[PDB]
Amino acid sequence: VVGGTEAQRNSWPSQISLQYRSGSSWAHTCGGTLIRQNWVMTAAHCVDRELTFRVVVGEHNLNQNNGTEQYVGVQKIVVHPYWNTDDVAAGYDIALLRLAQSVTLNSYVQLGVLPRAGTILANNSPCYITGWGLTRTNGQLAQTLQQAYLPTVDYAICSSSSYWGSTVKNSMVCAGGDGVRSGCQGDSGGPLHCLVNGQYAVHGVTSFVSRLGCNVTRKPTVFTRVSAYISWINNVIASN
Ligand SMILES: C=CCC[C@@H](O)CO
Numbered sequence: 694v695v696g697g698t699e700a701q702r703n704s705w706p707s708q709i710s711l712q713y714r715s716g717s718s719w720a721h722t723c724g725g726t727l728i729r730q731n732w733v734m735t736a737a738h739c740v741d742r743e744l745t746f747r748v749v750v751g752e753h754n755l756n757q758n759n760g761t762e763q764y765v766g767v768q769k770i771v772v773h774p775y776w777n778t779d780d781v782a783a784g785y786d787i788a789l790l791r792l793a794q795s796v797t798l799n800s801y802v803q804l805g806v807l808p809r810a811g812t813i814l815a816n817n818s819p820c821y822i823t824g825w826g827l828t829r830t831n832g833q834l835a836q837t838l839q840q841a842y843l844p845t846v847d848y849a850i851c852s853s854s855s856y857w858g859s860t861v862k863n864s865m866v867c868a869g870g871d872g873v874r875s876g877c878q879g880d881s882g883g884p885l886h887c888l889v890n891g892q893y894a895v896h897g898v899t900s901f902v903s904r905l906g907c908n909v910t911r912k913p914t915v916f917t918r919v920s921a922y923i924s925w926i927n928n929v930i931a932s933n
């Protein structure tokens with residue numbers, strides 16, 4: 694997250710860190726959202742490669758022991774059937790991971806709330822992006838969980854020539870674009886928490902940003918719209 698501030702360690706309990714084994718050590722690669730004690734929602738492009746993955750819940754500081762972490766392996770990866778690695782702009786950047794074990798819920802580990810199917814947020818709705826991703830374009834990962842205010846930018850506008858144009862679809866949500874705050878490499882798969890009816894629900898899964906840079910004016914961060922996949926999500930967790 695570029696232009697963010699450290700989050701209180703118990704503000705976003707559904708946030709998880711997706712990591713892969715590099716030889717003998719583990720490295721953070723993406724974010725994700727705990728939606729079931731044994732299910733995690735993330736971006737399909739985060740699990741495109743065939744590597745060994747593990748999920749960490751109740752995490753705050755990646756390099757320090759917080760005394761609240763839970764490490765669990767991933768036994769099943771269900772990528773959306775229409776996902777195409779070479780065409781992220783086509784959408785469908787979403788995947789579901791069945792964890793090898795059910796995590797224990799507590800003050801630092803909670804389930805994220807999903808929106809009602811087909812829900813569209815009004816332009817400029819209040820949302821927050823969270824993650825341990827790059828704090829600067831071509832920079833380095835954040836040690837502590839970062840958060841940033843990132844209001845939505847509706848489709849009509851986001852798909853206009855002055856913004857993303859035809860690269861953005863109605864199955865995506867755009868947020869930010871003030872040239873100061875944004876998601877960045879390492880935040881992918883993470884949540885876009887939006888305040889609706891006095892409650893924060895996960896309306897997006899971080900998908901991509903501009904090739905020019907992370908924080909670019911008129912180039913908001915693009916997210917997979919969760920409300921457009923509610924049926925698919927339930928169908929998967931119902932038969933797996
Ligand atoms: C926050 C998303 C970064 C994803 C990049 O790979 C796209 O340029």
Ligand SMILES: C=CCC[C@H](O)CO
Nearest residue numbers: 719720721755756834
């Ligand atoms: C296992 C801890 C996460 C490591 C990070 O990717 C950077 O050191």
Ligand SMILES: [Ca+2]
Nearest residue numbers: 754757758759
């Ligand atoms: Ca830690």
